[PDB]
Amino acid sequence: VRPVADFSPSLWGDQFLSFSIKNQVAEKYAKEIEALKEQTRNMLLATGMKLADTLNLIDTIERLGISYHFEKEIDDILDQIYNQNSNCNDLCTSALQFRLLRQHGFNISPEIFSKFQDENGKFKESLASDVLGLLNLYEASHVRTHADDILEDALAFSTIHLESAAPHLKSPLREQVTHALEQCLHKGVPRVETRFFISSIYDKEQSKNNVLLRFAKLDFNLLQMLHKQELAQVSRWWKDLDFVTTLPYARDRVVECYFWTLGVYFEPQYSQARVMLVKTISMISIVDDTFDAYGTVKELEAYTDAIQRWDINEIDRLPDYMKISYKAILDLYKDYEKELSSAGRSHIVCHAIERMKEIVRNYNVESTWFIEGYTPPVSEYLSNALATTTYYLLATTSYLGMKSATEQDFEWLSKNPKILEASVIICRVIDDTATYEVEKSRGQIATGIECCMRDYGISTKEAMAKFQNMAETAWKDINEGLLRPTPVSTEFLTPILNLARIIEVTYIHNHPEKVLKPHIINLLVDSIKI
Ligand SMILES: CC(C)=CCC/C(C)=C/CC/C(C)=C(/F)COP(=O)(O)OP(=O)(O)O
Ligand SMILES: [Mg+2]
Ligand SMILES: [Mg+2]
Ligand SMILES: [Mg+2]
């Protein structure tokens, strides 16, 4: 006897299946972008700029989503600003300097906020009528670490006054403030925040710089072309696996999986990485569904064993349908090895394989606890449930397509560094707070909130409050993990940071398909009108 399928069909049909990129328009865009890019570079390399104007320029280029073209230029400017350690006198410039520096790994001291607080460490209420300062303070309060307790009340302070000011602000500032209160910049998905800023804010800004705006629109639309080409290629690959018919119990969400990948990295250089990553996200959702709503204890046990052994000769020990999954998985990793041969990086593939074996083991433990009706103490729950987030696997997989990723980087990641663990915790805690009721109605007595309630002997509310504090602790750890000197290149930390952002954005409110729908349309269907 099998469970009631239910689930939901892909509401996207096949609108993404084929996309012909007319080079005529792409060539034109590429060509003007080159020119706008240099005009912009020259804007950055201009001498005699005041601090406030320099920070505003960088902040604008970053929000417009084109800063990836100026990594070096922006780095040198912030480095110089860091070392000049000048201390501006207004909240607005000080909070922006603090945020941009910290987001880039420069450990600027939070003491720059002292002058804005009374004698007992609390922000002067007289600042309540400085909206731009409050907005930058608000954004800055989200990048703090455990060593920034002088900013412990910054979030509440700026939030209360911004909510009060918002209704009477001019546009588009009002829209920017309202958006910020719903979604801070530091914790949002990069392309999503960029799309909103370009068309809802900057495009409607009186003082907007026409060069940057045009640059931002053409770039966003040119990259969108690449993304649509990637998604078509992926939809075709997914269509040719035809799990939609052979494994009718599994979800069909290749589009939502691709979106996830787009959140990890959107830049053109990560094209191969994205295609490789989406295949694993899609493949793991199938493995998950198999353990979630179909496979029997006996089948799952054999399924886990086969995975641990990892040999196409083991397929005979599994029931018909699992032979489909199992072979696909083996082939996928064989394909990765093949794709990396050219560059001579096929040896790193095993790291991803180990994470796959690991999550399968934990999936099996998960169902065992379900069958038994076991409610483990939080400590034990987390030891197993962290991996079932899929995040150790996704993070490891995100490195496969990155040309610069070396063995040393994978070794660092294999030891579960603090930044990765923080990202994994955020995902676990957010999902557990959001999926508590549902899973509970299925008698899944081993859900995080339940374990926490029984363990500490507290109410569901108190349990969720404790889990929120864990996510908060985790964000401070991620922020701290980005500070120089970093254990590996920042290029390898960003995907981990982005994974935490994606889950936060997906569960912004306690589905997730209709939460992602509008983002997918904005990033992959509709271009920004020039
Ligand atoms: C922390 C976790 C596990 C999920 C957070 C939300 C989502 C959608 C994450 C994407 C990861 C994938 C590929 C899943 F299959 C996730 O699996 P499931 O969302 O169908 O649900 P359960 O594994 O928690 O039963
Ligand atoms: Mg599951
Ligand atoms: Mg599931
Ligand atoms: Mg859940």
* Ligand 1 nearest atom to the CA of residue 260, by list position: 10
254 CA to centre of ligand 2 in angstroms: 17
Ligand nearest to the CA of 499: 1
Question: Which amino acid belongs to residue 327?
Answer: K
62 CA to centre of ligand 4 in angstroms: 34
Other residues' Cβ atoms within 10 Å of the Cβ of residue 330? 18
Tell me, using a 6 A CB cutoff, whether residue 288 lines ligand 1: yes
Closest CA to 512 of 129, 186, 256, 244: 256
How many CA atoms, within 13 angstroms, populate the side-chain half-sphere of residue 522? 17
Residues 307 and 329: their CA atoms lie apart, in Å, by 9
292 CA to centre of ligand 3 in angstroms: 5
- Rg from Cα positions in the chain: 24
Burial class of residue 29 in the structure, from the number of CB atoms within 10 Å of its CB (0-12 exposed, 13-18 middle, 19+ buried): middle
Separate counts of helices (H) and strands (E) for the chain: 24, 0
Residues 175 and 3: their CA atoms lie apart, in Å, by 46
The H-assigned helical ranges of 166-296 are: 173-182, 190-196, 210-239, 243-246, 254-264, 271-292
Do residues 181 and 162 lie in contact, with contact meaning Cβ atoms separated by under 8 Å?
yes
Tell me, using a 6 A CB cutoff, whether residue 143 lines ligand 1: no
> What are the distances in angstroms from CA 328 to CA 285, 306, 322?
13, 13, 10
Do residues 313 and 364 lie in contact, with contact meaning Cβ atoms separated by under 8 Å?
no
Tell me, in Å, the resolution of the deposited structure: 2.1
Residues 8 and 65: their CA atoms lie apart, in Å, by 34
Do residues 112 and 136 lie in contact, with contact meaning Cβ atoms separated by under 8 Å?
no
As given in the structure block, the two tokens for residue 276 are 């490789």
Ligand nearest to the CA of 438: 4
Residues 259 and 523: their CA atoms lie apart, in Å, by 9
Ligand nearest to the CA of 503: 1
If you ran DSSP here, which 8-state letter would residue 345 be given? -
If you ran DSSP here, which 8-state letter would residue 526 be given? P
Tell me, using a 6 A CB cutoff, whether residue 409 lines ligand 1: no
- Residue partners of 476: CB distance under 8 A and separation at least 6: 144, 145, 146, 148
Q: Which of 252, 264, 285 to mutate to test the pocket of ligand 1 (most atoms within 8 A of CB)?
A: 285
484 CA to centre of ligand 4 in angstroms: 35
- Residue partners of 9: CB distance under 8 A and separation at least 6: 252
Domains of the chain: 4-47+208-529 (1.10.600.10), 48-207 (1.50.10.130)
Other residues' Cβ atoms within 10 Å of the Cβ of residue 300? 21
118 CA to centre of ligand 3 in angstroms: 50
Do residues 380 and 260 lie in contact, with contact meaning Cβ atoms separated by under 8 Å?
no
Tell me, using a 6 A CB cutoff, whether residue 389 lines ligand 1: yes
Q: Please report which helix (H) or strand (E) contains residue 461, including its range.
A: helix 460-481
Q: What phi, psi does 123 have (nearest 5°)?
A: -55, 130
Ligand nearest to the CA of 367: 2
Residues 241 and 423: their CA atoms lie apart, in Å, by 31
Residues 511 and 209: their CA atoms lie apart, in Å, by 38
437 CA to centre of ligand 4 in angstroms: 9
Cis bond leading into 485, ω under 30°? yes
Do residues 359 and 392 lie in contact, with contact meaning Cβ atoms separated by under 8 Å?
yes
- Residue partners of 460: CB distance under 8 A and separation at least 6: 436, 449, 453
Q: What phi, psi does 498 have (nearest 5°)?
A: -65, -30
How many CA atoms, within 13 angstroms, populate the side-chain half-sphere of residue 176? 23
Residues in the chain after which the backbone breaks (C–N beyond 2.5 Å):
510
Closest CA to 477 of 139, 150, 153, 147: 147
Residues 185 and 140: their CA atoms lie apart, in Å, by 9
Tell me, using a 6 A CB cutoff, whether residue 230 lines ligand 1: no
As given in the structure block, the two tokens for residue 171 are 């546009």
- Residue partners of 52: CB distance under 8 A and separation at least 6: 88, 90, 92, 93
As given in the structure block, the two tokens for residue 320 are 């018909």
If you ran DSSP here, which 8-state letter would residue 147 be given? T
Do residues 471 and 395 lie in contact, with contact meaning Cβ atoms separated by under 8 Å?
no
Do residues 123 and 91 lie in contact, with contact meaning Cβ atoms separated by under 8 Å?
no
- Residue partners of 456: CB distance under 8 A and separation at least 6: 378, 462, 463, 466
> What are the distances in angstroms from CA 223 to CA 29, 144, 282, 324?
10, 32, 23, 35
How many CA atoms, within 13 angstroms, populate the side-chain half-sphere of residue 326? 24
Ion ligand 2: protein residues whose beta carbon lies under 5 Å: 288, 292
Residues 513 and 253: their CA atoms lie apart, in Å, by 9
Q: Does the CA dihedral 378-379-384-388 come out positive or negative?
A: positive
* Ligand 1 nearest atom to the CA of residue 390, by list position: 11
Residues 444 and 438: their CA atoms lie apart, in Å, by 9
Other residues' Cβ atoms within 10 Å of the Cβ of residue 513? 15
Which residues line the annotated binding site for Mg(2+)?
A: 288, 292, 431-432, 435, 439
Tell me, using a 6 A CB cutoff, whether residue 285 lines ligand 1: yes
The three-state secondary structure class of 283 is helix
> What are the distances in angstroms from CA 184 to CA 136, 192, 236, 516?
10, 12, 36, 17
Burial class of residue 6 in the structure, from the number of CB atoms within 10 Å of its CB (0-12 exposed, 13-18 middle, 19+ buried): exposed
Residues 253 and 455: their CA atoms lie apart, in Å, by 36
Burial 50-80 (b: 16+ CB within 10 A, else e): eeeebbebbbbbbbbbbbbbbeebbeebbee
The H-assigned helical ranges of 316-457 are: 320-341, 349-372, 378-385, 391-400, 407-414, 418-434, 436-441, 448-456
If you ran DSSP here, which 8-state letter would residue 151 be given? G
Cis bond leading into 248, ω under 30°? no
Tell me, using a 6 A CB cutoff, whether residue 281 lines ligand 1: yes
- Residue partners of 108: CB distance under 8 A and separation at least 6: 82, 85, 97, 98, 101, 102
* Residue ID of nearest Cα to ligand 1 atom 21: 288
Residues 175 and 280: their CA atoms lie apart, in Å, by 37
Query: What are residue 117's DSSP bridge partners?
Result: 123
Q: What phi, psi does 117 have (nearest 5°)?
A: -120, 160
Separation of first and last alpha carbons in the chain: 56
* Residue ID of nearest Cα to ligand 1 atom 5: 431
Q: Which of 390, 437, 501 to mutate to test the pocket of ligand 1 (most atoms within 8 A of CB)?
A: 390
151 CA to centre of ligand 2 in angstroms: 38
* Residue ID of nearest Cα to ligand 1 atom 14: 285
Tell me, using a 6 A CB cutoff, whether residue 427 lines ligand 1: yes
